[PDB]
Amino acid sequence: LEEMRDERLSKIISMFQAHIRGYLIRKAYKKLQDQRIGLSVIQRNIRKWLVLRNWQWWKLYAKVKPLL
């Protein structure tokens, strides 16, 4: 009755908030994809380092690298 009126107004508001939540997430999507690549780069490079840091060939290589 008047109950239905209040309930539909509450749903409408909630749908508008859904629209807002939608907007917020979709706006963050590109950064999320970019950050996924960034973190992949970070985890993989740290891991590669942990293996090669005590390998003599690498220690040579990294000293040669700056000289070209």
Binding site: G38, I46, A62, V64, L68
Partner: protein, 141 residues
């Protein structure tokens, strides 16, 4: 991969270490290269380095020794920008708790031993992880 610039880097490193222009790296090339940089390891270290290659150390043998260990590595710049991704305001630091969380609980999770060895010598001060300096470290030595 591996990327062409990384192949080109490897070839250039091979070329410099091959002081002979031999097309091979032998113990003399290695001794020569090391003495030009500082302390020269003793013959048994050098011989052992060379023995990691199952044949005479050609460039293709050199590729064979480095390719797997270098394949997924990126430039200091790329890694620095990777970190930048999480540093919106470009402070050149990251909250220590933030980078620990990313590394340990997200993506390809670091296990507790990877976490320990990572932050052992990490440049962290005032709760701030210096990622520019960290990058220099993981690419240096």
């Amino acid at each position: 991969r591996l990327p062409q610039k990384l192949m080109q880097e490897m070839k250039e490193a091979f070329t410099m270490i091959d002081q002979n222009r031999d097309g091979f790296i032998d113990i003399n090339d290695l001794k020569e290269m090391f003495s030009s940089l500082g302390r020269t390891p003793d013959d048994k270290e050098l011989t052992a380095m060379l023995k990691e290659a199952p044949g005479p150390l050609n460039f293709t043998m050199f590729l064979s020794i480095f390719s797997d260990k270098l394949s997924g590595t990126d430039s200091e710049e790329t890694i620095r920008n990777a970190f930048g991704m999480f540093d919106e305001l470009d402070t050149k630091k990251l909250n220590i708790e933030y980078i620990k969380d990313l590394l340990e609980n997200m993506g390809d999770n670091f296990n507790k031993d990877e976490m320990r060895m990572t932050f052992k010598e990490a440049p962290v001060e005032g709760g701030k992880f210096d990622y520019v300096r960290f990058v220099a470290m993981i690419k240096g030595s």
